[PDB]
Structures are given as C-alpha cells and as structure tokens.
Amino acid sequence: QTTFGPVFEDQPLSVLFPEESTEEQVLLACRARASPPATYRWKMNGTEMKLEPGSRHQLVGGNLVIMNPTKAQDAGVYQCLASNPVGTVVSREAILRFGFLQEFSKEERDPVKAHEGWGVMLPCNPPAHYPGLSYRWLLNEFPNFIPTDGRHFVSQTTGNLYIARTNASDLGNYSCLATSHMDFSTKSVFSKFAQLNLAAEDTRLFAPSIKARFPAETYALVGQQVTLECFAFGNPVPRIKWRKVDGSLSPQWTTAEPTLQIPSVSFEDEGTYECEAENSKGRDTVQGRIIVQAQPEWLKVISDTEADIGSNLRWGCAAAGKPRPTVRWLRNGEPLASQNRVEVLAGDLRFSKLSLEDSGMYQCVAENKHGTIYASAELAVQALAPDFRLNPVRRLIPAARGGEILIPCQPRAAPKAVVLWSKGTEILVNSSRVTVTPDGTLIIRNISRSDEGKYTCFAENFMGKANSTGILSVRDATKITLAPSSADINLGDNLTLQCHASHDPTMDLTFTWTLDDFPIDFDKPGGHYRRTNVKETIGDLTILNAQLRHGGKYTCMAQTVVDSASKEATVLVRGPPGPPGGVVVRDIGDTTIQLSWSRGFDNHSPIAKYTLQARTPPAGKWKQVRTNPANIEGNAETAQVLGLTPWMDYEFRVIASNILGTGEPSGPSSKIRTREAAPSVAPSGLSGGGGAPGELIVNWTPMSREYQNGDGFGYLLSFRRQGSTHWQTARVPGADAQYFVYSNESVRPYTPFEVKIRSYNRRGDGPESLTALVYSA
Amino acid sequence: TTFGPVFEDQPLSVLFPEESTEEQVLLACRARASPPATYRWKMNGTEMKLEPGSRHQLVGGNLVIMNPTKAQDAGVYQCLASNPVGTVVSREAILRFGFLQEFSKEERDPVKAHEGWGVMLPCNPPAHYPGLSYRWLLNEFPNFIPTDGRHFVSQTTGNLYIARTNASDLGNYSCLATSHMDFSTKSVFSKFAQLNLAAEDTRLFAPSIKARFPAETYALVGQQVTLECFAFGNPVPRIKWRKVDGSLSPQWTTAEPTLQIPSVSFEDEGTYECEAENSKGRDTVQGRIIVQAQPEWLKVISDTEADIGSNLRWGCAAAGKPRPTVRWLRNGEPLASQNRVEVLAGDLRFSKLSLEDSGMYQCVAENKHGTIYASAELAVQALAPDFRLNPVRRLIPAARGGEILIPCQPRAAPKAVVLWSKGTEILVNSSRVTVTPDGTLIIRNISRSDEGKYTCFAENFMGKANSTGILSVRDATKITLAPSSADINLGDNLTLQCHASHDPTMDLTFTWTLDDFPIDFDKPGGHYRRTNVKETIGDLTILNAQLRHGGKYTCMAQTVVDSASKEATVLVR
C-alpha cells in the first residue's frame, strides 16, 4: 500500500477534426495514479515522440496538446506510456483523423444520348471526401430539385441517377449536388451540367432489369444501421419486395420501398436476403448475405499478486469476441517471450522458481481485426526472515510414560527455513529412538523418566535465524485394570457393569460412559440407569428399571486432563416378539374365514406360536376363536377361523408368542361380512287371540339380527282348526313382522286353532316352532 | 508496538548468616516492557515506601537493604511491575536470618545409673536455626566417644544412649553442637555432667526399643529421609528393617540403627518396620511414610487479541498433592465474578467484549506447599471496513435465465451495515432481486435489462467503504441431443452422439467421461475416437471395446463460463 505501480484513470480517445475548422489546438488526455507520481511519454506511429519545448507539441500534466494542426504531419495514431520505479504501462491506441470535402472536376461532362422509353443512368463521380456524403440532383437550374418519385431513383451509395423510362419531359441539363453534413454546418458542391439527348420513341413494354445491386456480402458491427438498395428499370414501374430466405422478416421492415433499412442490427439479422422487382412483364431477383461481427470483451482478467520467492505461479486471461481474438503478453511495455522460467502459452503464463527480478507490471492484450483491449496487473515477490510469533513451539508438553511424543517446528519464512533440534546443549541426531523428519518434526518413542528437560528448535535461512524452546515432563499413563463383561437379560433384577482404573497420584481421574457413540445420561428420566460414588478409582454403572431399549455397544472411558483410556462391552435384552401385521381376510364363507398375516419382529428369539382373536363391530370385545390348525406354529402365516355365525360383520387380530412369553396383539383387520345361510333357531313367543268377527290374530316375538343368517328374512306360519288334518301356510315378509291376521267368514267365534311358525331367508328354510293353541274373536 | 511487562529475573529466597559481616542484601527484579516499566515493592502484605535516605534503596528495580537485622527486615517481599498497559506481580521471596545461641550457664545435675543397664544422658540444645550436628565428649577435649554398639548418639535430639554401662564409663560428659552454615562452621561446647554408677549384676534382658521414629513422617519429593531405631538389651541387639507391604530395596539395606533414603520417590510410600533381636528375644516397631509434592502447570493461558463483540474462554490447570486451588488476578488485583466476566475454578469466560477488557491477566495456583503464577495479555481491537482482502467480483459473468449470487463481506469489527445499489437506485428485497442480512445479494431469472454496474456499501461507527462490480449477460450452453445405452462384446465398435448450442462468440469444448473418469482420446493406440467433428457435434466412437470400457458415459459440453451434461450407459460382455 505504501508503493504501487501506475494505474490508468483517463485514457486517450479518438478525435475527428475538420480540416478548415476555426479551432487552434487538439488535446489528447492521459492520466495515471501512482506513488511516487508517474512520468508520461508519448509515441506516434510506433516510435517515441520528441517532446521538445516550444516545438508545436506540448505536454500539460500528461495531456498532449498540438496547436495549429494539419493533415500532413499530425494525422495518425498516438499512445501514452506511464512510468515509475515499479514499472511502466501503455494506454490504448488513439486515432486522430481529419475530415474534408473537395471540389468537383472542372472538365465538362459529355452529353448522354439515350432512347425515349428506356431507363437511363447518369453518373455523379464525387470527389475525394471523408466521411460519407448526401447526394441530390437538380434539373436545368437550381433550386429545381427532381422529386424522388417512382420513376427516378437517387442512390445514397454511389450518387448516380436512374430513370426507369424516359419521355419528352426528361430532356434538359442535369447536375449533381453533394451536401456532406458536417456536425456543425453543411458544405455544398455543385457539379457540371450534363445534357440529356433523347432519340425517337419506341413502343414496347419490357421486363424489369435490376441495375443497383447490393453486394452479396455485407459486414456490419453490432449496433449499426444497415441499408440495402434495389433499383430496377421497367415499363410499367416495377414493385419492390424484400424476403428473408432463411427466416421471417419483421413486419415493421416489410415495405414496398426500393430501399430496406435496419436501424440496429443484432445477431438475429445474419442470413440471406432477396429483393424482387415484379411487374406485369416479369420479375427480377437479387440475393445477398449479411453477417454480424463484434468487438473483443473480457471474461477473466488478472489482479495484483504478492508471491514468496521460490514458488510457482499461473496466470490466465480470457477474451471473447467474433472473430476469435488472439492474446499476447507485455511486461513493462515490451513483448514477452519464453525466457528461462516464464512459459507463455497463447493465453496463460507459468512461472517456475520465482526470483527477486520477476517483479513489475504485466499486461494482457487481446486483439482482432476490429479492436484491441488491455488489462493490467502487478506482481511483487517477497522474502522474509524466520518469525516464530505465529507457530511457536509448545511451551509445555506433558507426555505419558511409555508412549510417544511428536513436536513440530514450522516457522514463517522464505524461501524455506531449515531447522535443527537440540536437547539442552546436546544436538539431537538420528538414533534408535529420536527421529527428525525432513519437515523438522521431532519424534521421541519409548519415553522414559530421564528424558525430561528443555528442548530447543533452531531455524535459519539466508535472511537470518530464529529459535524457540519447550519443556517436557513425564507423568504416569492412566490405565484400565478391569474391563466390563458382555451379558444378556430379559427383565431381570438389573446388572452392574464394572470399570476399574489406575492413574497417577497427582491428577484427577473422571469416568464417563457412552452407548453406541451417543452421550449417556446417568440422571433419572423415568426408568434410569444409575452410577455409584465411593472412591475415585471406581466407575461401576447399574442398569435399573428392568426394562427394554437399553442395549448396544457400551463404552467406559477413564480420562484425566492429559490423556485417557477406554474399554468396550455389550449387553442384550431378550423378550417376547413384536406384534404381527398385514392381517388379510380371504375365503369368506358362512362359518369359515381364512386369515393371512406377515411375520413380526422376533426380538432375537424365534416365534413359537400364534393366537387369533375376533370381535364384532362396533362395541364387541375381542374374543379368541377356534382356529385350524388348533395350534398355529411360528412359521405359519395363514390359518382358518371356524365357528363364525353367518351374515354379521367381524374384525380380527393376531398375537405372537415365543419361549420368552407372549407378544403384543396386531391391529384390527378390515371390516368383512360372512356369507348367508339358512335359519337355525325357530321363533318363540307364540300367542294371539281376538280381533274382528271371523278374524284370527296370531302374535309372535320379533326375531333379532344374530340368527337371521342372511338377507330376505321372513316367517312362515302354519295354522289349522283343532281336529283338522290340513295346515294352511301363510308368508309374512320382514324381520320386524310380529303379527298375522287371517280372515274367513266361515270361522265361528271362539274357535280353537293350532298354530306353528318357522323362519326363512333367501338361502333356505329353518326349524319350525312348537304348536300352540289360540282362540278366534 | 507496545506490550505489558514480562518478567526475566524474579526475587529469590535468602537466608542470611549472622556471622558474616556483609552490609547489603539484594533482591532482584527485572521486567521487559515497551515503554520501560516502573517498579514497586511490597513487604509482608503492606506496600513499601522507598524514599531516599534510610537503608531501603532502589537500583533500577532491584531492592537493596543496608545492614539488615532480624527485628526489621525478616519476612516476605514481592515486586510489582507497572507500565501504561498493565501491571504484573512477581513471585514471593522470603528473607530469613540464621543464628545460634549458647548453652545455659546453670550446672547440670549428676546422673546416677546402676551398672548393667543402659543410661540416657540429655543434651538439651539451645535455640538454633537451621538444624545442628551433635557429638559427645568424655571428661576433657578431644576425648570423642566412638560410635560403637554401646555408645549411641541420636541426630535429631542429641541425647546419648548407653546400652549397658560398666566401670569404664565413669566421668564427665559434655554435648558439642556444630552448625554448618553457608559461610560459618560455629561449634558450641556445654557443661560437664558427672555420671556415677552403682552395683553390678550381669543378667540378660530382651531388647527394648527406646528412640522411636514418628508414626507419620511427611516428606516432599527430593528430601533425604532418616529413620532412627535405637535399642537396649543384653547383649547388644541386632537391628533389622523390613517393609510391610513389599520389599526393602536391599541395594542399601543395613544393620545400623539408622536407615537412610537419599531421595524419596513416590514408590517409597508405605509402612516400615524395625526389629531389635538378641538371643533373649526381640522387639518390633512400625511407622509409615507419606510423600507429597508441589504444584506444577499443565495448561497455561497465552496472550490474545480479540475483536469487540466476541466471546472468550480461558483455562488454567495445575497438578500437585494436595490438589491445588486456582484463582485469577487482573492488573494485580483479585478478579471476582461480575458483569460480563465469569470465573469458575480456573475457567474465565468473557461475553460480548468491550474496549475496557484490555489488560494483563494472571492465573495463580497454590497449595500448602507452594504457589505458582502465570501471565497473559488481552488486547481488544476495533477496525474500520476494508475491502482489500475480499473485494467484490469485478467481471461477474451471468448466464441467461439463471440465478446470480454476489457476496459482500468486508473486514470489520464489529459487523458493519451493508447496503446495495444498482447505478443510483437502492435495491429492496422483492420477488426478483433480494438482499440477505449477511450482505449477500441474490438475483433470479436474469435478463438483458439487468446488465450494468452494482455497488456494495459497508459502514460502521468507525468508517465506511464501497466496492463495485460489473454484471453482464450471455447465452447459456444447452444440450439438444443425448446418447443412448447399448450392449456389445469384446472388440466391438460403438457410436454415441451429443449436440449442444451456445453463444456465437465463445468456443465449445466437448468431452466424454467414463464413470466420471475423463476419456483420453490422444492416447497412442487408444480405443476412443471423435467422429463427426463439428462446432456443435461431439459424437464419440469406441473401437475394440474391452471389459474396462463398460460403464456410464457422460457427455460434457462446456465453455469458459458454463457447462451442460448428458448421460448414457454402455455394457461390454
């Protein structure tokens, strides 16, 4: 930050200057920030310019001023170079150009002879000029301007005049006027008159002939306006149309005018265009292609860098543009080639084994036939003396007797500080114990009591030397003298795992437990394992509450403030298997239903048997049902359930059992209904009597849903007179039916009757009831 | 470049022999500092006034006393080093005086003993410091009594033991006490005690141990330990030692009535047993030895610089026996739990630091055998924002329709407020452009209208800074054709296709990776080839397929700024 190279702020810009302008001087700017302040030099035409006092060119704070300019000694390209002790940089190339407009030739123009009824071409022949001009035509005398109608075409490219069909009105003298529009005023140049002579008039129409043909290839940059001209001769005047061969034209550009204008060409407009001139006599066609190119841009540049001497570096620079650009490298204002270590490859720079002479300003230059761009950076190499303030050696290095120690010495130095280890005043060297790796790490094995003391690391390099000290003392290692034993239990009266340790008599010793690398909690949330506390050298832990979910890889660890030791053990908890799943009802019959289920978790003990329970929705309790086979084995997954009463809904569940006990019941099965069946219970509550004269009423108790056993439930009542041998059967549909009335005028009052009843459904017939004696009205 | 005082020379304990006629005592103290530090001295708790004049002087930190006396100068001294940053405390140094008094002038009573028994002759040494060495003289100098099995001398009380007196022991006895100081070897006589005896009967008795070593003998590590087992008996009893709970280490086992250990280690703890045995019988005595040590360090704090608004944890651990206690000092004054500082048995916790928590801190570990110190310096820092280390990207590229991240994290303490601005319009969180409260900016579904300049402003109560980047949009590479899976045998040829589209400006590079491993097409005799090589065609062909050529083939189509991939599978039997 104290010193930095020249960084540009303002760079020179191109200037267009009128040759006969009233201005007296031209200013080109160049400014750079530097510390110390930079010095500026200027290059013209690739060579250095003699900045002499008084002689035209003057230097004002970096800027270059040229007074009373002329095209013979000033027009050209200039560069500004900024320099200081760190390095030099070069600004972008700046063009200064002059504009002018000459006068028309004094030689008389020959008269043009043509046939009446034929298109005629009249040249203009503009003089030397820059930039482009605007062209007009006049007839006979100024200011009579020929209108730009459908019969006369005036070209803005060549300035010529085209007449589609000549008649007697076109005879006269023509003149071409140039009105080059300067940015401040307009200068006009008037051409010598040319006489147009016309021969005898013919009488014939003709097909169009296109004369002003736009070039096949037109190159344009992104953001320019592109004009295409298409003029043709023809009687009558042909119509002009523009088409895109490889696409669709914009509606705003689809015009019948003989000129096609694109205000801002983008990457889309690239392709082939076709102009067609059509009349009743025929058509003529022109084809030409428009391409689009751009100017280089940046994608990845370089930045300031500080590197340590003896390292390697890689720099990159990426530019994008159409056509693809080329990238070259400059240092301090001169091109870079493959030197001893510098490797330049078409865009990337490789440094190997940096030195103190490879510092300065580096520039990356991208170039193509439409422009150039520059990018700057600064490389600074550094060399330092060894400093231990960042990684000092351990000031205290406690070590356990019988183990090993490793002490690394790594200072901050360049190129690389070499180190040597010593113990007190005795220099340590390779032996069958002490080891010194090339990195400087000191490794001591088989550590004993006589190795305590003060060790020193000495580092040095061709800058200077540094030095540091540590002290080593020897303790006794913490050891385990008893390890816990693996075990297994179901729900017993709890188990005490043991862990005994011996430590140095000077430092505190703490025991800690863990389960499968998850932290343990010997406190008391609900069921809890607990920990005793009598003396330091004991760590027994008792697993209480006689419950589940307390198995894994138990680990006891005895640790001090310095080192630690550990041992491992395993416990298992056995028990009844888990509940089954996947209860599926199949083969739904009147009394038999097949049940299928998936095997549940065995809990590390094979399942011995199964038990099936059933219930009636919605408030029926779970009841064990008769199963085929009577004893279901653990490996079986299907069974039969018997004893079911037909045509009610049922739900089922499964329980598993092993030699260790009985597991949990499974979830309820899906609601299913058994098939229909014939009735099995005869109706009861037979009674009756009274009614209208000649009528007999028989009443019975309505039957519930448990014994209907199917749909279409109803009753059949067989009744007869006392002493008669013929039974009359009546059908009463409906389960809730409870009475029947039989009407007959021949029935005497208080006539005894013998009756019986039976129940039926859609499946079959059930048993009949006992015969009862009733009386009529 | 400033720091707090760091001690190089600390005061040391001094014992002054009275005999030597020196006129000045020096207690050293030196503390490196920048700027140089001043010194104060504390004498037995209270501060010391070092006014020029009397015998208390100052020689540049070092304290000098002219002509010290026991009545005005014995005691404890501490050195306090102070500079603008903070002050530090030096380890205590004890100044003590050594002297010896003479024996009392009163005559000693004669000792009457009956021949055939052993007799005890007292010495009664006067006041003394340090310990002495004792001898006995018979009648007249230099008749030194030889150290045989019958004439017995104790090195801790000076008493004289006679196992069995006879007629040859009649006479006068005196006790001579000698001191071995650093510069003097003064020795003192005594009076003459007359020993008169009685009749004789030569009977035999069982040994009786009289001089008993104490039941518990506390001994630090590194202190020579002597055990005395003195006995009576007729004839002379024999002395044998044994360890109750192990071996006696017979490298130095002896039959003398004294047992010596030059340097006590932790393995010598336990109970010893002495036995005096003769043909008549035996006597047995027991006693235990316990070892102890001084505090030592295991983890020590180090000087630290912390940024305002942070938190700090500091630890300090000591090892000794009995277990040491740890306390904390700041600027030479005790530090209790208050405000943002928490102290817990050697754990120091700073929460949300400020500019007033900069200074010298110290950790003290002590027990009934010693005290040790450790020091460190804490410096708090506050900084202005700077973007030199982490400037915003300067040439940010963007792919069309993508999402762009722009982080902005300067180097400041405390954290600085961050604002964003495109051109001269300050952005707000919305559905397309959003800022997050760590400073990062997010933009979604980028378009050509977003090209331009972006700027990040950072500011805190010490200053402000800004950094600008340039955002431009391009055309993203998109895959139009993908390869397909196939199966072949060994030696078969297969062809897979891949097509992409990109911006007309940059270059496409097409590659193929077999199971994420790039395929080398330039290998001599290689089995892979590029076919239908065009700008947007990256078809590859495998010739003479092998078993290793079966796997997943991934087509990579990449430019300098973006890439796009497709996948297919090939099996070789």
Ligand SMILES: *[C@@H]1O[C@H](CO)[C@@H](O[C@@H]2O[C@H](CO)[C@@H](O[C@@H]3O[C@H](CO)[C@@H](O)[C@H](O)[C@@H]3O)[C@H](O)[C@H]2NC(C)=O)[C@H](O)[C@H]1NC(C)=O
């Ligand atoms: C003290 O003994 C140790 C052990 O033999 C020495 O360390 C050994 O150092 C050599 C190099 O002197 C290492 O061999 C070479 O290492 C380079 C590292 O890039 C490697 O490229 C070579 O292929 C070769 O392996 C060797 O690995 C290393 N071994 C160990 C165990 O450290 C040490 O150098 C000796 N002390 C001195 C002062 O030489």
Ligand SMILES: *[C@@H]1O[C@H](CO)[C@@H](O[C@@H]2O[C@H](CO)[C@@H](O)[C@H](O)[C@H]2NC(C)=O)[C@H](O)[C@H]1NC(C)=O
């Ligand atoms: C260990 O490192 C020091 C630090 O460079 C070496 O230099 C001494 O530094 C102290 C501290 O300022 C000075 O008081 C001494 O005068 C320095 N010595 C010399 C010779 O300049 C020191 O020499 C190193 N130790 C050894 C044994 O070389």
Ligand SMILES: *[C@@H]1O[C@H](CO)[C@@H](O[C@@H]2O[C@H](CO)[C@@H](O)[C@H](O)[C@H]2NC(C)=O)[C@H](O)[C@H]1NC(C)=O
């Ligand atoms: C508007 O700005 C606010 C803060 O400047 C953003 O709020 C953050 O939202 C995220 C996600 O909900 C939280 O994790 C942060 O804690 C919020 N910051 C604060 C300071 O509250 C918010 O995301 C922005 N709006 C949108 C649409 O993103």
Ligand SMILES: *[C@@H]1O[C@H](CO)[C@@H](O[C@@H]2O[C@H](CO)[C@@H](O)[C@H](O)[C@H]2NC(C)=O)[C@H](O)[C@H]1NC(C)=O
């Ligand atoms: C963004 O930061 C720059 C500095 O990095 C500011 O530029 C400074 O502007 C002030 C006055 O506007 C000048 O006095 C300083 O000399 C400028 N510094 C440099 C290094 O040139 C800039 O003003 C900041 N932007 C805003 C909006 O404040």
Ligand SMILES: *[C@@H]1O[C@H](CO)[C@@H](O)[C@H](O)[C@H]1NC(C)=O
């Ligand atoms: C530099 O070159 C241009 C074009 O080649 C030329 O017009 C100009 O005269 C040259 N410069 C000088 C000083 O002649």
Ligand SMILES: *[C@@H]1O[C@H](CO)[C@@H](O)[C@H](O)[C@H]1NC(C)=O
């Ligand atoms: C080195 O280790 C071996 C076995 O571990 C041991 O016998 C030997 O005594 C050790 N060396 C020293 C110096 O203690």
Ligand SMILES: *[C@@H]1O[C@H](CO)[C@@H](O)[C@H](O)[C@H]1NC(C)=O
């Ligand atoms: C403490 O120092 C004072 C200063 O002379 C002295 O008088 C006093 O005896 C000392 N106390 C102890 C216990 O040493």
